[model samples]
Target chain A: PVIEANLSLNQNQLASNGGYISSQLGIRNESCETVKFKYWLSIKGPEGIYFPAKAVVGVDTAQQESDALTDGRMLNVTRGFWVPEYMADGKYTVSLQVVAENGKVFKANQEFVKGVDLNSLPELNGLTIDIKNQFGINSVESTGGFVPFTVDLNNGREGEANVEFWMTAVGPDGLIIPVNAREKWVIASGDTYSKVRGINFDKSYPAGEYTINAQVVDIVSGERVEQSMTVVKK
Target chain B: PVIEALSLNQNQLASNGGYISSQLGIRNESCETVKFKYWLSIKGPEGIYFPAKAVVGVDTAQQESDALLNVTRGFWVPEYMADGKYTVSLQVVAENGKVFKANQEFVKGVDLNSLPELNGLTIDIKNQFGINSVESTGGFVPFTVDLNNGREGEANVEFWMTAVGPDGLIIPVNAREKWVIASGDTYSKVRGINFDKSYPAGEYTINAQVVDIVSGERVEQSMTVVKK
Candidate 1:
């Protein structure tokens, strides 16, 4: 017996505005009878440091193969893990393990750098930011769509560099929205660059025109890069 | 490892005044570390049931063999759980497979008729409406405290009773402090019960009792009368 299980999170990274990690797990049970299971989550930080582990082994059921977020007969359940404000900072990796009946098990691993990345780049002293969506399009339908900022970063220094990357927004009335992300990253000199598919104008954002801002800072070298974009909700 | 466990309750029970169950548990003297699981529930009133939620590994350090398992879980009445006698229970399953279970009963929608037994005290509250509203107490309606020490010895007794107006409110009654009682005696002292400045004048009921401060017993009684 085998289970093709996959786990996804609402936010892969939370900056100093730490809130919750909304988790939905997918499980394709290949067995006859509906199954019972236990799920556990653990995080590892810099220097091999470990955060206290959390586990749920209580009664609760998940139907086999439920949502569009599934590969095969995956189960869907949303659980929130509260991450308090100003949490311990650094590159963090969160892992998930689900053990099912009949001795079958499934596991998944995900990482957040600066609490966040998506593309590969060449080494250079400069990092540039731009906004784009699924296509070369920078706009989205009022309904919902992905419009993330693009980043080309290269730490070409001889010494290690600490980086802070964040995204924030203000909407139609020039008022701030709870839409933001913050992450911290430490990089070595001349490290390979990443075309980070960084922060997004994420939300079924209340209908309006929003001015979203993105920034990245080389904490050690004192160099900074900033960009802004206007996204439409309609 | 061996474990000894004991469970206790608060106010054995209450009449129409649904309250709490004070739970205390004791561990065996020979055990070094103690831990267990607990279950709490309300079982009374028809069509009302709350299943026990699981709680695991309740490890506690006991100084002299006692740990509090206090359950502040409550029971309410009048259009709530069917007004009837019900039990509140607390059960603990110890590490060694030893079980400790405790329960207290409660009754709702009860009038003064179903009072706790007079372990040794009986109180009679009398009033003379023949008097007027302006005679003295805001003219205090004259009433008296009646107590009988039916126990083997003297008793420290307490009385908690109040007068209610027709509109179902407390008009000011004289400040009647508690009184002491000797064996086999009756306490008849007149005290003025007053009315609100613009008191709704009509029928009023006196609900009260003399409690045995020493033995924790009482005879609750009530009387309905007309007022000027």
Candidate 2:
């Protein structure tokens, strides 16, 4: 007879159910004899370990396992837990490990992230630019290519009629890389906008290190969110 | 129609949850529709805001007599918040020229309800020094506690045992670690105390507190505990 163990939670990776949720770890002993095991559950996050590892020497019998497993559910093993509201903002991982007395071990892992509300505060997320045929940070072909640079905007509120964006690229040794165009648009409360622009460079374009700077200004409030990234050319 | 207001944190005022959660009663009382403006500020020990108030946005339009119980709006309480009395104040200005303000105070620490309570305590004085009522030798003593958690959720609790040693100074005679207990459960923790010459024994006293971190007290009693 084989002894089986499984662990599951009430969340589907991305959870938004406030702070409280139910967690369960179950064991099924198919043998007529009693089965012995050692189990431990631990939770960790960006901050640090929430709980340490400890063994639970729980043993069960076939009768008990079958009685608990009803319709793919083990109601008796469920345990309700609360993630304090203050520490619930980051991504967390829950892990469970079971070691049977007969040298059989089972493990389970679950990762979940609490949805961020931004709470009406717009923030800057990812900023990246793709440069093709990059070899030692320089193009092997040296053929002219448009380097597309992109950034995201989060207005997440009532629209602004006078939203403005400014982007510039500066080359090493005080050289300026000119962009082809400007960007300006109205932003609504729930509007999501990604501004992408490109800079053209051909052969004989000397580069050591260049930096791209982009900024979004709420014209009405004069509040600006700015970001910068460096691109190296060998 | 807006009777907007705000509420305080979970641990009364101390936000062990690393952040604070707030709720606003966004009620529309007037017959005409209106907008809402609110500000939240938390002050630490110096009576000055540490994690200062953030920008507020409320583009409100609720029907007459309509009320929203909880427009949950809160911010993170800083990890480096000093130990002291912290105050939370909420100020609101409604579109209909109605103004409101609510102020509450909370100390920074874990929630009291979430901390383990002393249902019982046991101290076993063992003489391992091969002597009787010895004053300048070592002995093995144990202190055990019966902790109970009556809340519906998990609780993080800490307990340690020490004794009033030589010259009436408190010294550690045991080992204790942080323990987490399940909802509505009870646990017992025990550890042996190493009473030595350094801890010259006389009469032992229990200096124990289940919660509230020590606040520097300047008095002989209310604020301070002086050994005789």
Candidate 3:
């Protein structure tokens, strides 16, 4: 006999970098015999992207000598997924289903959102700068090599200005490596500038989280725009 | 500028077993940082191309210094694949729509074409319901035997089981003359043997053996059963 089912998440919000999500589902078994079962979870993004994960388990027979019909056993199911910090903002739904050996099924659903506000940086002054590596989004391997950083600058200033761009990277161990392109360019009012630069590391470099800090400075007015992003090596 | 490289770990494989792995390397000399996608496909002995498996969303950018980026993937040779030379091709597409391709070939042959041999055969002594220990109720104890055919051809084999009771007395359980098993397959079964009413409550040893009727290759295993 099947009783009830429930589903829940560990948190409601997550950051684009170093963010993880954990989900759990529980079911109540009210029968005298042991129950073998399988379960699956489906996670759907606001944009119709879907991911399915599944597994199997069992509810062992009750040990106490009591009326079999009145014995209650609980089956707890749990799993986790690394929610890419690069996903679009909105509510994401997680659904679950559990099927018993006798073909009985139970289901439940829960929802959460990626609510990190990324606009806190005042350096870019409304300009956008984005960076990513070969490993897609959010993370990269710990064995270091050449990592490319892409920079984009949008000019919202009132007049034409010359700009100088460079990047500085620091790991958790207090080691700093700076790559200075110092490339100078003149951008007309309300124009955009984009370029790609590479950073190399030996395999012996320390493994941990890193921050890539990028800055674009206007040569004429002394005003500057800066942006920072996080990545993991593991 | 773009260059692509690919290589396989093995140039020769067995159609009846094993796996092949490939590594891919890409270099970008152009100033642009772009997202890229790649795929792998195979051409069989009959000159037919299999559907490609793709890995997408790979981003690449020109390094501050020139350097190469590498990735690896593995494939298992199917048991039913025809034995011959097969070609593997890799293709890459840049976010800017530029394309690159590379190919390599490997040979597949039947390495296990002889009579079947037992390489991983096992035996277990347990209770009637399959538990490792038994509570003797003057009934029966169960024993299971697993026979593996690791050779290249199917085989008809003979198998037998024997038991030495706690009293140090030998007892014969079963003897089958001919059981057929296919190449690279495993055959397993459980048999129950009755315990004597006066069987002592102690340790007993169970022995199981399999013999290839054609090749006369024999393999055997033993397990101890605790009767409490």
Candidate 4:
């Protein structure tokens, strides 16, 4: 019987938003018999006791030629725990314990730290739209082709950045109605203007105002700027 | 010594991109020493071909976990000339030439034939403003965050939408521009409109204007209506 384990952490640091932490694991076995294994994880901050986790692993036996090791199996495991803002700026450890079919036990560990700065993150400062050609604006037909739009990046920290635009065509229900084309743009330091031209849209959009959502993302560091505005394609 | 070999045609595959063909071979010094190997691969809608690969083993064999047999190696193995969407898929063959499992994602090759029919996704189209203000009627002051004279020498596109009519609906347009509501007025929904009374009852939609402050090439979208 053969057994091996590997590990990874979602980010070096978590957001003050207090979201869960994520991790990944890979497993392999050479025995002819089906292998069943039970595993657990533990997280220990710099000063606190090592607390055991109530985490589950998403099993993945699929292997690719691109895989560094490809004899047995792989598992993409996610461990979610209350990551308070207070603990987001410190180092943490992730340990895995496993029991194989032959009753052989194996253990491995990895470490990572969180250092996401709140101020350096981009903010969804604001978004506004003015219709220049007031009369000919047809909500449904005009939206069928790529409609060009612009966004302003303000109070933005000086660094390399990218912007992702998410537009939800609102139906009468006030919820998002999905469409075919979603847009993304990359902006470098000391520059502005994120635009999309020739974006294909639905032809039969109900004659009502639709909601356009915008978010700014930092490529070097993963931070997001969220904002929304209303547009009518009459 | 532990050794492994891996291969792939390219780094990325677009969805429904193309077929990926590949092969793999493994040798274990713990069991026996020295050898050569070969195999074949068949992918989505594509034919199969022979691929040759080899590995040598010198036994001083210790534990299997530390043994050379545990490591499996693979490659595109040049025998199969690169063709439609040829990525290094994986296949394992015993030194005796017994075909084991050949693994690879038959990515739908990205050719005109495999390309997806363009479908449109819904998005919010609206107007945006510059950073400035102007005084208005009543005891209220209006801010003029205009396209012209806003920021200089940059190109921009302004998008806005309008429905057939207006209604009593509160649509929120997000922003981070510092707004200090001055004396004797409520914050108005209209950009830069400082008023003494509430907005008139009707279907009022939002519009956005973008000005190339430097090039002065201004483009605008009209009639952005927010539903009631």
Give TM-scores for every candidate, taking all chains together and pairing residue i with residue i.
0.24, 0.26, 0.26, 0.22
What's the lDDT for candidate 4?
A: 0.34
Q: Which stretches of candidate 2 lie over 4 Å from their true place?
A: A13-18, A30-34, A52-76, A116-234, B1-228
Tens-digit lDDT string for candidate 2 (A101-159): 55354556665555543222224222111222222223223343445555556554554
Per-residue accuracy of model 4 over A108-222 as CA lDDT, tens digit each: 6665554534224224322211212123323445445434444454324455455433333333322233221223445555565533322223443334456444334443343
| Residue B33 accuracy (lDDT) in model 1 | 61
**How much lDDT does each candidate structure score?**
0.45, 0.42, 0.52, 0.34
TM-score of chain B of each: 0.40, 0.36, 0.39, 0.23
Candidate 4: residue B91 Cα off by (Å): 40
Best by lDDT: 3
Kindly report which residue stretches of model 1 are placed more than 4 angstroms away from their true locations once superposed.
A33-36, A52-74, A85-90, A101-103, A114-155, A158-234, B1-228
User: What docking class should model 3 receive?
Assistant: incorrect
Error of 3 at A160 (Å): 1.0
- Interface C-alpha root-mean-square deviation, candidates in order: 31.6, 25.1, 27.7, 30.2
Residue A19 local lDDT, model 2: 69
DockQ of each: 0.00, 0.02, 0.01, 0.01
Residue-wise C-alpha lDDT for candidate 4, range B156-198, written one tens digit per residue: 2221111111221222122212122222222223333221122
Ranking by lDDT: 3, 1, 2, 4
